[PDB]
Amino acid sequence: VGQGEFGGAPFKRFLRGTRIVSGGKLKRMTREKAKQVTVAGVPMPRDAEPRHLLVNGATGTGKSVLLRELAYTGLLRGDRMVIVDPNGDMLSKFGRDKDIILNPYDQRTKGWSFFNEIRNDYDWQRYALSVVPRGKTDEAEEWASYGRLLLRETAKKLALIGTPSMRELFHWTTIATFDDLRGFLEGTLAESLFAGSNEASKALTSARFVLSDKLPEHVTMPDGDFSIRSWLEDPNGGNLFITWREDMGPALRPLISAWVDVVCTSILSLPEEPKRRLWLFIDELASLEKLASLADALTKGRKAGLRVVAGLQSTSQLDDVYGVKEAQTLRASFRSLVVLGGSRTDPKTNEDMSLSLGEHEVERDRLERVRERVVMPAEIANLPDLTAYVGFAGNRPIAKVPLEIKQFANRQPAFVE
Amino acid sequence: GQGEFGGAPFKRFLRGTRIVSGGKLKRMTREKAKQVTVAGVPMPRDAEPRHLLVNGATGTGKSVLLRELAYTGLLRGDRMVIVDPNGDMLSKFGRDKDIILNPYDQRTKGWSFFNEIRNDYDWQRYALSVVPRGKTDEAEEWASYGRLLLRETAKKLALIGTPSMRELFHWTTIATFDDLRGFLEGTLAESLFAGSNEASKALTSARFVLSDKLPEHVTMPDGDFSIRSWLEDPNGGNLFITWREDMGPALRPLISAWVDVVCTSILSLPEEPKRRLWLFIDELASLEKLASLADALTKGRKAGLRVVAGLQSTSQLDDVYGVKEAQTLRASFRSLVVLGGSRTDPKTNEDMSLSLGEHEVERDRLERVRERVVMPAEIANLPDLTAYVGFAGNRPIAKVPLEIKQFANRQPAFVEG
Amino acid sequence: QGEFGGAPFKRFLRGTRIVSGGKLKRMTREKAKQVTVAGVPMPRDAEPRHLLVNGATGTGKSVLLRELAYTGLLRGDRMVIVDPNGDMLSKFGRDKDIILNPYDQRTKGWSFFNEIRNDYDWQRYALSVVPRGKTDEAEEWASYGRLLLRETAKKLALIGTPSMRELFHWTTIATFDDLRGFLEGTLAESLFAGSNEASKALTSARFVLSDKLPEHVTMPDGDFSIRSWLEDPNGGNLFITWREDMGPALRPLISAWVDVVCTSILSLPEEPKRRLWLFIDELASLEKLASLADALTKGRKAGLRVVAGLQSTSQLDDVYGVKEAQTLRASFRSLVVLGGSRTDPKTNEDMSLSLGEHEVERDLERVRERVVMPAEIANLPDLTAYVGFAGNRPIAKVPLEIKQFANRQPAFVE
Amino acid sequence: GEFGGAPFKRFLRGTRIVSGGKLKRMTREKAKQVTVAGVPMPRDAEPRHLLVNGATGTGKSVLLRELAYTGLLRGDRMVIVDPNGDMLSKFGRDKDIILNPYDQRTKGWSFFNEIRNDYDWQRYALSVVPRGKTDEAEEWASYGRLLLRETAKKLALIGTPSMRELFHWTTIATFDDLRGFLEGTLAESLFAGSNEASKALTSARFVLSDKLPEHVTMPDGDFSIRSWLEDPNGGNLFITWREDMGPALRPLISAWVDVVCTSILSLPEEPKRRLWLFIDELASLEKLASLADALTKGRKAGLRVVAGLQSTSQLDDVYGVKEAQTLRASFRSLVVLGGSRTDPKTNEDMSLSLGEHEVERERVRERVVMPAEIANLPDLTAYVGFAGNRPIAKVPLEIKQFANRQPAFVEGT
Numbered sequence A: 001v002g003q004g005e006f007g008g009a010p011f012k013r014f015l016r017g018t019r020i021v022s023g024g025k026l027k028r029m030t031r032e033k034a035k036q037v038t039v040a041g042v043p044m045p046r047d048a049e050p051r052h053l054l055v056n057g058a059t060g061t062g063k064s065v066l067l068r069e070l071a072y073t074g075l076l077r078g079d080r081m082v083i084v085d086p087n088g089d090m091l092s093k094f095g096r097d098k099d100i101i102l103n104p105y106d107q108r109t110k111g112w113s114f115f116n117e118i119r120n121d122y123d124w125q126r127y128a129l130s131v132v133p134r135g136k137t138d139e140a141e142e143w144a145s146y147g148r149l150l151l152r153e154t155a156k157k158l159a160l161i162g163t164p165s166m167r168e169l170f171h172w173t174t175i176a177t178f179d180d181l182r183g184f185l186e187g188t189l190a191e192s193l194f195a196g197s198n199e200a201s202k203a204l205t206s207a208r209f210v211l212s213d214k215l216p217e218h219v220t221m222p223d224g225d226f227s228i229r230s231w232l233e234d235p236n237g238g239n240l241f242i243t244w245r246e247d248m249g250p251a252l253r254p255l256i257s258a259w260v261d262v263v264c265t266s267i268l269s270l271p272e273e274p275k276r277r278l279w280l281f282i283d284e285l286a287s288l289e290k291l292a293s294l295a296d297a298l299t300k301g302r303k304a305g306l307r308v309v310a311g312l313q314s315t316s317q318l319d320d321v322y323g324v325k326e327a328q329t330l331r332a333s334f335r336s337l338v339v340l341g342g343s344r345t346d347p348k349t350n351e352d353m354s355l356s357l358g359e360h361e362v363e364r365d366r367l368e369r370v371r372e373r374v375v376m377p378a379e380i381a382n383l384p385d386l387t388a389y390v391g392f393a394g395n396r397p398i399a400k401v402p403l404e405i406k407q408f409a410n411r412q413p414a415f416v417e
Numbered sequence B: 001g002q003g004e005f006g007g008a009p010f011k012r013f014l015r016g017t018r019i020v021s022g023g024k025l026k027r028m029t030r031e032k033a034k035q036v037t038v039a040g041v042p043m044p045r046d047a048e049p050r051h052l053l054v055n056g057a058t059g060t061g062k063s064v065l066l067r068e069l070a071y072t073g074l075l076r077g078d079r080m081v082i083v084d085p086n087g088d089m090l091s092k093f094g095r096d097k098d099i100i101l102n103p104y105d106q107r108t109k110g111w112s113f114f115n116e117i118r119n120d121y122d123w124q125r126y127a128l129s130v131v132p133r134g135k136t137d138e139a140e141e142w143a144s145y146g147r148l149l150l151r152e153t154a155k156k157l158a159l160i161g162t163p164s165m166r167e168l169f170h171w172t173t174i175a176t177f178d179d180l181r182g183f184l185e186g187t188l189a190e191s192l193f194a195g196s197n198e199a200s201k202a203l204t205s206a207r208f209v210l211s212d213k214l215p216e217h218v219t220m221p222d223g224d225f226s227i228r229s230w231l232e233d234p235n236g237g238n239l240f241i242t243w244r245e246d247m248g249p250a251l252r253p254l255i256s257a258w259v260d261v262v263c264t265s266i267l268s269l270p271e272e273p274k275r276r277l278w279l280f281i282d283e284l285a286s287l288e289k290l291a292s293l294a295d296a297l298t299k300g301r302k303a304g305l306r307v308v309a310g311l312q313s314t315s316q317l318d319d320v321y322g323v324k325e326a327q328t329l330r331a332s333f334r335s336l337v338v339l340g341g342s343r344t345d346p347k348t349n350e351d352m353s354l355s356l357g358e359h360e361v362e363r364d365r366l367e368r369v370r371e372r373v374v375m376p377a378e379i380a381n382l383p384d385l386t387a388y389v390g391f392a393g394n395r396p397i398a399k400v401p402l403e404i405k406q407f408a409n410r411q412p413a414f415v416e417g
Numbered sequence C: 001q002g003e004f005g006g007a008p009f010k011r012f013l014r015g016t017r018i019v020s021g022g023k024l025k026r027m028t029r030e031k032a033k034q035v036t037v038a039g040v041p042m043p044r045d046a047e048p049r050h051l052l053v054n055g056a057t058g059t060g061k062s063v064l065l066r067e068l069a070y071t072g073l074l075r076g077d078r079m080v081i082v083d084p085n086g087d088m089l090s091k092f093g094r095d096k097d098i099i100l101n102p103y104d105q106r107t108k109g110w111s112f113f114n115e116i117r118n119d120y121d122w123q124r125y126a127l128s129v130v131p132r133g134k135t136d137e138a139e140e141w142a143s144y145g146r147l148l149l150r151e152t153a154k155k156l157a158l159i160g161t162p163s164m165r166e167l168f169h170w171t172t173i174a175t176f177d178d179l180r181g182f183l184e185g186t187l188a189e190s191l192f193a194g195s196n197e198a199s200k201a202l203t204s205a206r207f208v209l210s211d212k213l214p215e216h217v218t219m220p221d222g223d224f225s226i227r228s229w230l231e232d233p234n235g236g237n238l239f240i241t242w243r244e245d246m247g248p249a250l251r252p253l254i255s256a257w258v259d260v261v262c263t264s265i266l267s268l269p270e271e272p273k274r275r276l277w278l279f280i281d282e283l284a285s286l287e288k289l290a291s292l293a294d295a296l297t298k299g300r301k302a303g304l305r306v307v308a309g310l311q312s313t314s315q316l317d318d319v320y321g322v323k324e325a326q327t328l329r330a331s332f333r334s335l336v337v338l339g340g341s342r343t344d345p346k347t348n349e350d351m352s353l354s355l356g357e358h359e360v361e362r363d364l365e366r367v368r369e370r371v372v373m374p375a376e377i378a379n380l381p382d383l384t385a386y387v388g389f390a391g392n393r394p395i396a397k398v399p400l401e402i403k404q405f406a407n408r409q410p411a412f413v414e
Numbered sequence D: 001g002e003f004g005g006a007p008f009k010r011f012l013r014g015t016r017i018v019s020g021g022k023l024k025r026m027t028r029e030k031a032k033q034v035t036v037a038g039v040p041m042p043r044d045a046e047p048r049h050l051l052v053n054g055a056t057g058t059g060k061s062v063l064l065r066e067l068a069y070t071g072l073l074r075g076d077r078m079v080i081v082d083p084n085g086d087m088l089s090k091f092g093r094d095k096d097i098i099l100n101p102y103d104q105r106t107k108g109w110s111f112f113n114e115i116r117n118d119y120d121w122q123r124y125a126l127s128v129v130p131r132g133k134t135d136e137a138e139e140w141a142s143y144g145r146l147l148l149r150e151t152a153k154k155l156a157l158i159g160t161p162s163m164r165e166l167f168h169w170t171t172i173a174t175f176d177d178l179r180g181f182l183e184g185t186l187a188e189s190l191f192a193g194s195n196e197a198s199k200a201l202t203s204a205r206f207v208l209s210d211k212l213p214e215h216v217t218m219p220d221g222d223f224s225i226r227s228w229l230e231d232p233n234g235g236n237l238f239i240t241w242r243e244d245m246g247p248a249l250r251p252l253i254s255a256w257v258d259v260v261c262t263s264i265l266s267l268p269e270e271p272k273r274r275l276w277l278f279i280d281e282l283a284s285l286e287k288l289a290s291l292a293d294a295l296t297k298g299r300k301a302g303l304r305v306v307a308g309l310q311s312t313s314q315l316d317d318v319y320g321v322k323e324a325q326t327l328r329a330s331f332r333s334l335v336v337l338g339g340s341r342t343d344p345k346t347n348e349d350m351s352l353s354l355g356e357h358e359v360e361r362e363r364v365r366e367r368v369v370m371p372a373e374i375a376n377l378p379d380l381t382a383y384v385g386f387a388g389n390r391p392i393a394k395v396p397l398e399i400k401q402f403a404n405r406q407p408a409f410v411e412g413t
Ligand SMILES: Nc1ncnc2c1ncn2[C@@H]1O[C@H](COP(=O)(O)OP(=O)(O)NP(=O)(O)O)[C@@H](O)[C@H]1O
Pocket: A058, A059, A060, A061, A062, A063, A064, A065, A066, A385, A386, A405, B301, B302
């Protein structure tokens, strides 16, 4: 009782805890009436979709294969999605004519400015958050905030005087002299705030530095009227691919983090639509900045129909980015998890997964109760590629399934220009 | 099951890490194509770009192994870069078409970071290599100011046709605040470094930093060698980064820069499925907090990057990269070699024992037991030239003897300038 | 039994193994001339892998280090001895041997300038003179200090006046401006001027130097060179001594010397026949040394053999920091445990654990247990220690005997 | 038998406990020894120091009192951090010394009285200016010491070793004046040149203003703790104070305690010397700067320290956890008196310090004394574990009576 399924010694009777079942057994169990999507070949419980999925695993284990499969099936079902797509891979395979591209250096990119998303006044601070993500440390954040003040008041004015120019915004916030800026600032809320003491000056200095760090890309970005918000609202909008070339990843980190974040806040204003189904594919959560909206999005987007799919390698990554406490909370927001198997050199993360997978209490022969890990950390480290454990959200058993490499023809060039 | 497992033989293996005899393993791993060897064991082709981490105390044979690894890899005709202390590898394997980087060696190439700038984004990219990551939060803040100063200055110098390192150095650490300030007019850094005491303070920080790093970069012989181009040239040969131990502390920042340079550069190389590149970082913990190693270890699969690094105690790398980042770092090496350490370092021994893994077994008193395949004590009592080899993925581990193959000197290790 | 403290067993499976003193003595015995640790002959190959002698006060750390030294001398090995109250000196002092003690008639004249030979040597030793800062912040000032130091000293050297008095004057006495002036032309010229931060940096540096330099200044002058000494074969031995009521005063000086050797040995012409010992009676009593680390890692070629003493884990920890202290201890492959106090269970555990556990089969039931319990360590009688040489060797509990040595020289003079 | 847990068939290894009497016999030696709760202390365990830990009212007094008495009967000399002149009123003789700025019988003292060589200046600024609790605190502390030592040095130089003047310059004189006064001294430059320099000075001021007070208001004299130590017929020293002034005197007392700690290190080697340092409550003093080495190098001097502790958290907070551990580790002999059930952490620490044993009944490794056993201890009942390879024992402390041969306090004139 517990073979081909459980890795440990077969037992006599299951008492309580996590239940592990064979791949097949699971594939039936989860199969439902409606059209569903697949995770490693397993039919995903329709109700698990807006509970978000977290795919953890080492490098080269198949995260791609999986999210790719996941994306395809969701398409065959006609779902819309946003894909943090590195090197436009997803694009070249699934990209369609009516779909959108965000890549400041790609011939096909859309013209965009965060201005293109302001619709109410509260929207100013709202997006200053997407542009200027959260500071890694308290101190860093403090500066970050000053930056958002400067940003929002400046852009607010430029807009008012009919010149919503990123170049202009950049100039003022990082080039104009202190005094000139100060002058420009007269009339806006920031007028006083940034003057009166050394502290005040210091604060302004910090704001400048941050903006000079984030804005660069936002400026050199091709101009247009494209609105991520509007796009979301348009049914026939199509899909969105945020692509970039790997050797520039660090340079775009802030921009992309903005976009991704934009979406995370934007979806929250979308009009009540029970039929909407949107996917957010963030290949590597840890490689983006400490997003400001992600949190709530993973918590209040069920109504909008948001389905997030993110991947990770070591737990230490997201921790260092979001902070220990904040990282915990964030992960905890993904109700469904996939374990792809990691390296032996990282025993701590293998333990985390082993434990996330859970224990079970069993009655075994010689009678004796035993409480034990369903999957040992060892088992996870020793996993061969394209093999993973799938534990869907809620009350469902878990199973070890093989990942198959379906082939997809390239229906578009990954990059242009 | 004796002769391979140190504990009590057992009746049946249930799950977890499995250990096997040296030979047994050597057969299992043996493949059709030409492979390389780790302590005599043929390394599975697929595990090569998953990187190898060799951990072990001093005098245990880290050299002998890396030496073997390198040799075998050359016989197959692979290219490589070697952080080579005291030109050891050089004097044994160096050929005439090979490259040498050592500011104090008659044979070195002429180089400056300028030689690697090809696009605008390349400025910050390399300022990162030049100015490695700071050890503390504060530290890095300073480091960032340094890079700003560095990149804007160097950019201008280049612009006005005088890409001089001596010039750059002058400006950044010699020129008076004002003069420098003047020179920066017109560059992005013009305003950012002026306006409040904070602004001034920031500049002072950058000066200090650059004054610390640049030194060696200047006194470096001039030439036009480009690590980038080198990487792109097939008949390019190999690269040896050598130095005499008494000067290790002095070159740490330059070497770290080169190493890093490689780490970032291979990310821009044109698609070549036939490429095989090795990076030998004799002792990862001795370099600075490299800014690109991470992604290198994660996205260099299709560039064909294969990294081999050595470590002694876990506290070493921890102290350099920080506990969270170090975890992530080590976790990026899929294959591991445990050489055995000191009884004065139980912590590290524990970590290695644990990384090796536990197993669940069934023994005759039946008896289920979960236990460490390799005891911490076993590692501390290992005799030299003896080590556990646990190749990436799903494979058993084995305790193998390392043998001292002799290599004739086919070149002088150092040639005073 | 008689060898293992716990219950005798049926069969040894894996892990650490303990044996009888004599049995071990047999095992470690080699052909060539060897030295001894508590009477046990040390494996020639274990020598450059250093030895850490841990134990409580009065347990016999001296008796041991004393014995080790003697045997090594009988073999003709050279050595440096961080020797407190010149005890080691009075016993083994030779006429051709060197003494470093600013308050001893027989000391040699020394200035750190005496070790500069190339340009990279300036920072190299600023490191030895100005050890590492206990805290991150502390160290930051320390860096400033070394900048000020190296640039100043470098210039003084240039203008042909390598005076420690001048140097001290400039770096802690001259007015800010004057100094600033003197600095014109040197790399430090700009770095210490331009903003309040820049001046703060300077200030910090000043305080540092004013704390370290003192003893260096009041030190008898001469041309002696630790480096040179190291290169000279007929050189003899080096005793770094001092009177205990002045230890704190000299701590930075001594720490400087110790370190200087630590970096120095790294430049010596390779000589497979060289055998040098570094006796740092109490590692934790010095400053956070800047070279010690690499010394314990790259000195096999030079033939460096370090022997240090320690009491509580917390000590070294407090000085080098937890992470650094781990690394540091880990660098000594051979260990001796002398047994400590009941009042320190934490260190006792550390020792117990370092000694290791073993897996055994007994009357079948098999068990995993510590070869030596912390309690065993705590109840150890004096002149009794566990010897666990580096590598794959069993450990043994041996008695340390008090051999007597006649005083062939005065410990202190004048 | 005397073992709290279940009787066993055979002892294998670890801590061994025995009956009071049995121990009393084993420990008994030829020469004259002293007694810890009735048990004669192994002479060789004396310079290894004794740590007596116990909750309030468990008998700490009765013990140190006993210890002290038998020591005097042997003719040993000693120093006693004696709160409210308790020990004094009982053992004080005519030839013994007293240090209490508010007692008619106190001696006249200034730290100047201990300066004999140049290194002696910093040496004692350390005693006067204990170590700072935090890293930042100690930073200030060092500035203070610089100011202190440079100033006092000069006043001494110019022939006016006045504590009143010293106090004036360091906390009263204006910045400039002070600045002026310092010209010529090493501190001349150090404290000027930038805001950082001025900030350092401001800090040094404050520190001094915190420590010096009592040192000033202290009755002047020529007494020298150093000289006292060197003088054989010197007698005994009693550092006493009234409990309601303990916080105010904390710095001065710590100073004295510390002074001794450094000073004994200079004494000429005298194989016959036997000195005791009684610090009733170690955690009550400041972060002593010399205590450490004293507990490690005072064997030659014949120093014997005895300190008392309550909660491990006290000492930790004062000396820092790392440092606290080291310090505690320095006493080889320990006495556990039993504490509150409201402090299980320390109970554990003590239980653990007492140790485990491996016994045969099956083999079992267990604590010789449970944390609970320690919390449920009745008063005047303690465990004794002398330094070295010795068993421990649960022994009863009896209240011997001592006649008052001198008034505890004498606020006079
Ligand atoms: N076209 C293909 N042919 C064969 N095997 C493939 C192919 N694509 C992927 N694989 C296998 O799946 C693995 C990679 O899975 P994947 O999900 O791409 O990993 P990743 O960590 O996300 N990225 P990468 O390291 O670039 O492979 C490879 O190591 C192969 O074993």
